[PDB]
Amino acid sequence: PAQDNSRFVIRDRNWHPKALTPDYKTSIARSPRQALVSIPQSISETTGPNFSHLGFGAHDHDLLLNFNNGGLPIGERIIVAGRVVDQYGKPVPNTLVEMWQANAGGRYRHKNDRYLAPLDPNFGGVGRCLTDSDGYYSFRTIKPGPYPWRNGPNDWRPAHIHFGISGPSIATKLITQLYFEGDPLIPMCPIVKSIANPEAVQQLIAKLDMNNANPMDCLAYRFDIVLRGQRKTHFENC
Amino acid sequence: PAQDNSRFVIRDRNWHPKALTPDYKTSIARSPRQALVSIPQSISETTGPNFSHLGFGAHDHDLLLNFNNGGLPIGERIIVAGRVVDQYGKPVPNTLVEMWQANAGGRYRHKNDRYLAPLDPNFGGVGRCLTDSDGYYSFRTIKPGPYPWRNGPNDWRPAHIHFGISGPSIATKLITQLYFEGDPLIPMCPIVKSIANPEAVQQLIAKLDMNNANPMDCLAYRFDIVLRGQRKTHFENC
Amino acid sequence: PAQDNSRFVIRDRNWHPKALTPDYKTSIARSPRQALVSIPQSISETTGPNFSHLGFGAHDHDLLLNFNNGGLPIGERIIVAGRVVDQYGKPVPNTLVEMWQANAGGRYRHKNDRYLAPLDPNFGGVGRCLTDSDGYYSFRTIKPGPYPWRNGPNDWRPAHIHFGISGPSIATKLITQLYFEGDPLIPMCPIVKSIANPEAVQQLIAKLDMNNANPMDCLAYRFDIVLRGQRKTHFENC
Amino acid sequence: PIELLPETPSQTAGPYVHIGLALEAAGNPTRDQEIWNRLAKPDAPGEHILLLGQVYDGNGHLVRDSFLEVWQADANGEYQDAYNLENAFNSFGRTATTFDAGEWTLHTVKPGVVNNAAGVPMAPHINISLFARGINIHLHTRLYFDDEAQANAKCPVLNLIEQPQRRETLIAKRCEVDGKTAYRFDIRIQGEGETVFFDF
Amino acid sequence: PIELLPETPSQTAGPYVHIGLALEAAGNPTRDQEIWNRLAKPDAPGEHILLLGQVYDGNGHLVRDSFLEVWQADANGEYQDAYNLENAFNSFGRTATTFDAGEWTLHTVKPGVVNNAAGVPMAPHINISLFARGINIHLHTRLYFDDEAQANAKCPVLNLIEQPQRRETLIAKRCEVDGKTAYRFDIRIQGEGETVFFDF
Amino acid sequence: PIELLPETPSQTAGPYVHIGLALEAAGNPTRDQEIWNRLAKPDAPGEHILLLGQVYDGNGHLVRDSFLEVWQADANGEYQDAYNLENAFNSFGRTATTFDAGEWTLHTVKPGVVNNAAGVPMAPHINISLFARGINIHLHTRLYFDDEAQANAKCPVLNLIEQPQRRETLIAKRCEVDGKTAYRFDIRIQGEGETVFFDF
Amino acid sequence: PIELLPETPSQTAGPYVHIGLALEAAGNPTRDQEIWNRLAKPDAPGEHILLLGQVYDGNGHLVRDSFLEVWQADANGEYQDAYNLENAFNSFGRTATTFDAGEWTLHTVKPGVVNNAAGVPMAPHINISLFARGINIHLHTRLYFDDEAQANAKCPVLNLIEQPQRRETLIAKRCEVDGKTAYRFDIRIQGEGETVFFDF
Numbered sequence A, B, C: 001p002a003q004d005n006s007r008f009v010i011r012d013r014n015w016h017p018k019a020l021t022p023d024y025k026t027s028i029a030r031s032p033r034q035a036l037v038s039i040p041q042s043i044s045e046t047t048g049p050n051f052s053h054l055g056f057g058a059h060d061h062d063l064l065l066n067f068n069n070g071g072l073p074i075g076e077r078i079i080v081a082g083r084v085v086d087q088y089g090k091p092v093p094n095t096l097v098e099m100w101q102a103n104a105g106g107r108y109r110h111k112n113d114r115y116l117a118p119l120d121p122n123f124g125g126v127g128r129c130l131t132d133s134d135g136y137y138s139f140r141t142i143k144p145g146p147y148p149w150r151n152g153p154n155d156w157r158p159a160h161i162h163f164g165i166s167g168p169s170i171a172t173k174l175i176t177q178l179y180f181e182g183d184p185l186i187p188m189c190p191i192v193k194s195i196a197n198p199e200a201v202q203q204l205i206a207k208l209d210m211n212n213a214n215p216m217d218c219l220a221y222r223f224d225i226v227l228r229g230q231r232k233t234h235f236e237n238c
Numbered sequence D, E, F, G: 001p002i003e004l005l006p007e008t009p010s011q012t013a014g015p016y017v018h019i020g021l022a023l024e025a026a027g028n029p030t031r032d033q034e035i036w037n038r039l040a041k042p043d044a045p046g047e048h049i050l051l052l053g054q055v056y057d058g059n060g061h062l063v064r065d066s067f068l069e070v071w072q073a074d075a076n077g078e079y080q081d082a083y084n085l086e087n088a089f090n091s092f093g094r095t096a097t098t099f100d101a102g103e104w105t106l107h108t109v110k111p112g113v114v115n116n117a118a119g120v121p122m123a124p125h126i127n128i129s130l131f132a133r134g135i136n137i138h139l140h141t142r143l144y145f146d147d148e149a150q151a152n153a154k155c156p157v158l159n160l161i162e163q164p165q166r167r168e169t170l171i172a173k174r175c176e177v178d179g180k181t182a183y184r185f186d187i188r189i190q191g192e193g194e195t196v197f198f199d200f
């Protein structure tokens, strides 16, 4: 079983978005009004699931093939790849990376999406993989389209892919969103702008990666992820 | 019939791309090696077709509806609109604007396109319209995807829409390409870079136009076009 | 017989003052805590009253004559004039412009004003007019004095004139305040500073306009007003 | 992106708004023609109704200096934009809360049904814009009628309010005031029972 | 000071989180192996229990699109981190609220006691992380059990909550669902009865 | 100096120009009205002629994807600018090379003489603009007729070409196609026999 | 975008390249082991062939200081990267043009067929890289065989050359040199008959 053998650097909750960001309207009633209670790290917080023994299907990381209903999806073929490291720069191997997204026209395959843009019969919008022994992950997909939504009267999400990353403990687990280099919707989005620091926003922008492209086939984007730094315990209980 | 009643400002052929731009490989053997011969404007050059009496179908400007085979195209729904003016800032009304493009995944509906990305059964890729009495045009379409092509070993066109504009004479007729604000492929493209002056490249970049968007429906881009300045003849033959 | 033929550019509610601006103390209990609910424009929102046939008295725009009780008001004689346009730069003709203000000493002719500065027996402080066919309005008045008020313990409104503008629809209707070029109270006022963006504050500062002055008679200030941009509907219900 | 000229920013109307927009309430004389709270003359077609209400702040206290503008269809569901005091009906009017009691009144007819931009019928409603001291930009709301339950349930605007409980804040209560049909519509700017306010 | 690489910033999971993390709930087909809400095979050691709950916003309305991750010791006080659908017990699981009733469920065993880093026993608890539309960074809490009052009163984590009234928000209520032992743990994100949320 | 707004810069039409401007050639359905290569109805005034040609690159290879626009006077020396598929004659048309043989065709009448701006007669000519993949800005030329030698020798435009040998590149060769009067006008973009291209 | 470390830029080998890479040709002594122009010892399996050729500049003049590197499969279509002078066959070698006559020679076996990355057979070929004074970055080409016409016609690399006439520049001509099977492969760097050069 798991052991308490490390500590994780405390989060900067001014680098992360705060809970109450009223321009993102749904945050108003879904943000605590009392302060978070700080607690010291114990085995409950410094351990978490490892997914090395989860059974992955052959196409779980390949959204061009994992919802195959007679053909290929319509849209901009792209590889999305990167490295997961911690704040000390150490790779995070064998960690679970999950992603979900709309199709090329901004339509989600979800029962609650009422946007008029059509579903793509060959696109589902879900991927997962494990980082390799050096911390690298890779997905193949189509670039999602921007998504209008009922926030302000003319609000549109930039093109984006939702990400979840487990990391070594429940203290490191993170959900975030990837945006695409140059997208003019990024500075206008109230969800992006839930992050107060512009340098933090830049950390969510994936860069065009021509080096990783397959000529005559697909482009590529690179999105590196940084989880909380992990260190050994020291000088405790004395 | 047409009359010779105006002169058109001489083109700046260092603002336009030159003929020989070898990084665009097909230009090498398809560029003249002799100088162009300058000739004065006559009625042959200062007149041209007007298309006010061309019969347009109801959906000729609407690429979401003009190739209807049972549904809507997949892709980022957008209006592409702008104004055609001349170099003196005068609107160019009742002028023919034509456009053509690939689908959301960068596939063209043309017998010679061998790219593996699929056709969209509800998308053709052709539009036309006439500017209104104030010089404005409008199309509705989906945003095209980047297009790999056999130039260098890993070359990709930025997302683009081809445009043709007639204007008042054969001296004003122009074919060009529209690119999209922020696209990181633009600085890398040898066709874009056939234009030597970076300020001229910027003139081909359409801007996101939230004011013209239809909420919960489609985004919009604005692309203004400038044709050669037209002036009355003066002090000729004396 | 009003018709739904236009759309109005969505408001930037970070350019406008937000509801909750606590240094303006009365805003604390008079600001909603729930998000506004965005709704699409319908004929209910895109129409509004036209006041072309409201009956104006001869001096309704002339505060030097419209409360005449034996003489002229005491104070700095000024013309206040400007143009009402929309965000596309189009004039807004035949629109209702209403204004109200304190007298030269900062005293309002209102039963609830208990400031010790005296009323002026020849001054009422109310004007109205219609913009002309080119969007221009004009008032004649005296420059109002600053007004102390029970906000903080030593708060003073800058000299100001309250404005209401109808525009083409209930969606364009606006109430605002005009301030005067150079007034050192402007940066200190918590009502001015309900506007977060300093560039937006500048849009409320009327400029001295010597070109519009009557020598040996009255000075003049220019205050232009911009209402929401109006455009034709396009590509709706298809 | 394309950036247009910015709109002139809003400011509060302040507590002396009635100097400019409700002259009598300020304690001052009126002009020959004023825009006020009687939208319908007696001969106007439709069901003649009195509307009345009070406005509350976040502490549950009356907002005694409120100024309201209203915009509604006639009984046949048509908006009448040609404002004229000679008209039997005008679609536009103004009212204000009394300083002692905090109550506003409007004399009108019940509006007919008007379709939204997609052709879907909206339930009968009056569009309201609320201004006052402390309100930096006016608040938009709608007054619907409690005797139009079937129409209200199907209204495409009411249905954009996610929680049914909040929809209830927009429904005026039918009653009788000195022998005349009336509807009471209270507005709560903040807190418990907060009235839905719109952006458009 | 020493500044490390900044952590990637959080963003909301959004209302379509189910596409990625709760496939059946999205209305979509599932993959051969999914991480879900049954932590214990029938023969896992310990007391088999159902956990269930609803999630409320600041207006008292159900948060019907919430997604929860849980982490708990097994009945013997051991964290089983080698996730495997063939395990008798997994310490990790996922659940989500139903869209109709807003209720999530978890099938598990009652966790055994584990010590904190100073060697002091913590009362039996489930670690919970809550994600949803409107939640920009997930909320951490703990579910404790109302039939462990003696242990709860001595828990060095519960004792870091300054007010006893707030400690009560973390205590799940024993009940029975279909005649089987259950504990209900409702979460109130905001306002009256607001659930304690942790930073660590 | 006075600097006007710059002209929008040209770009290549690319090899899929047919999608937009020659729909049938792309392999695609046509619209009810298309601008194409039959300038004259059978009963149009003048001498009915076929024009045809091939386009060569600097290596002597066919440019199989070229697109041409033409502008010419009618038989009476008048430019008919009011484009209409019902016109007896249109001064404007479009054509494109076939992909197999690289040959374009035009059906028209021989143009009448028009004067230049100084009142000097120009020899009968077709104005041509050539577009293709690899051509960054279109190439302007003129097609003159080999059976108008006297007029050609006096043309004030041909006389602006300094070398007589280069003037020969603009002279189409009379021939017969299917027994009907035709003129062949091959264009050599580059190298030996390079066609004169104009700026104006 | 993502920018990697830039590659070290190329420079010409210059006219004294043989000091470093062809020691004998410089007029200097050799080391015990040199990389040179005999890829096959007599006992190597396959058809033993002599290759020879001359290199021409844009004026049709011999390039007498050319240096060539070659890379080819063995007779069974396998690339042998373990370079060793003890081997019966090496896939790699070097040659240079003689200063008097301008001719290079290679002694090898005809390569077997190797598949491209999509599994499509390529026609038998030798990969060549050409270096010299005046050549700033080396030129890549391929030598194919005129007695493999059927395979050459179907080669997916040859088919990427748009013009059939240019494909002909890559086909070596079978002949006999003092009683041995040989193929002549001349390279024309520039102008008439210019050899196809590749980027990859």
Ligand SMILES: O=C(O)C[C@H]1C=CC(=O)O1
Pocket (backbone or CB within 6 Å): D168, D169, D170, D171, D172, D173, D184, D185, D186, D187, D193
């Ligand atoms: O109180 C309510 O529930 C509804 C609100 C709408 C009219 C009114 O008088 O109050």
Ligand SMILES: O=C(O)C[C@H]1C=CC(=O)O1
Pocket (backbone or CB within 6 Å): E168, E169, E170, E171, E172, E173, E184, E185, E186, E187, E193
């Ligand atoms: O009942 C309470 O108020 C306590 C809170 C903890 C568990 C639960 O169901 O609600």
Ligand SMILES: O=C(O)C[C@H]1C=CC(=O)O1
Pocket (backbone or CB within 6 Å): F168, F169, F170, F171, F172, F173, F184, F185, F186, F187, F193
């Ligand atoms: O025959 C030539 O060389 C002249 C050139 C002009 C017409 C044509 O067919 O080619």
Ligand SMILES: O=C(O)C[C@H]1C=CC(=O)O1
Pocket (backbone or CB within 6 Å): G168, G169, G170, G171, G172, G173, G184, G185, G186, G187, G193
């Ligand atoms: O000359 C040619 O046509 C082909 C070229 C390839 C081998 C050779 O000797 O010359």
Ligand SMILES: Oc1ccc(F)cc1O
Pocket (backbone or CB within 6 Å): A020, A032, A033, A034, A035
């Ligand atoms: O806890 C809070 C309470 C009120 C507020 F405005 C912000 C907070 O973060």
Ligand SMILES: Oc1ccc(F)cc1O
Pocket (backbone or CB within 6 Å): A150, A151, A152, A153, A154, B215, B216, C038, C039, C040, D160
């Ligand atoms: O803000 C909105 C805009 C368009 C729409 F259809 C619904 C909305 O709530």
Ligand SMILES: Oc1ccc(F)cc1O
Pocket (backbone or CB within 6 Å): B020, B032, B033, B034, B035
């Ligand atoms: O006409 C030309 C000739 C040779 C060259 F390199 C460039 C040219 O523009």
Ligand SMILES: Oc1ccc(F)cc1O
Pocket (backbone or CB within 6 Å): A215, A216, B150, B151, B152, B153, B154, G160
């Ligand atoms: O440069 C290329 C790259 C990939 C391919 F399939 C063909 C090419 O000519």
Ligand SMILES: Oc1ccc(F)cc1O
Pocket (backbone or CB within 6 Å): C149, C150, C151, C152, C153, C154
């Ligand atoms: O007289 C006063 C002076 C300052 C203030 F804030 C309130 C008052 O009543």
Ligand SMILES: Oc1ccc(F)cc1O
Pocket (backbone or CB within 6 Å): C147, C149, C157, D013, D014, D015, D016
């Ligand atoms: O601008 C004002 C400030 C305070 C007040 F009471 C009334 C005003 O008109």
Ligand SMILES: Oc1ccc(F)cc1O
Pocket (backbone or CB within 6 Å): D152, D153, D154, D158, D159, D164, D165, D167, D168, D169, D171
């Ligand atoms: O749909 C509704 C409309 C009005 C109301 F009061 C309650 C509702 O649930």
Ligand SMILES: Oc1ccc(F)cc1O
Pocket (backbone or CB within 6 Å): A147, A149, A157, E013, E014, E015, E016
């Ligand atoms: O990014 C999103 C925005 C709005 C929404 F309803 C779902 C999303 O996934």
Ligand SMILES: Oc1ccc(F)cc1O
Pocket (backbone or CB within 6 Å): E152, E153, E154, E158, E164, E165, E167, E168, E169, E171
């Ligand atoms: O110490 C406590 C622990 C749990 C609780 F519900 C109340 C307490 O006072």
Ligand SMILES: Oc1ccc(F)cc1O
Pocket (backbone or CB within 6 Å): B147, B149, B157, F013, F014, F015, F016
């Ligand atoms: O833009 C393009 C690029 C290459 C091609 F083959 C066709 C195009 O339309």
Ligand SMILES: Oc1ccc(F)cc1O
Pocket (backbone or CB within 6 Å): F152, F153, F154, F158, F164, F165, F167, F168, F169, F171
């Ligand atoms: O003047 C000329 C005109 C046409 C031509 F072919 C040759 C000439 O010398």
Ligand SMILES: Oc1ccc(F)cc1O
Pocket (backbone or CB within 6 Å): G013, G014, G015, G016
């Ligand atoms: O660098 C050099 C320059 C000229 C030359 F002849 C030989 C070289 O090696």
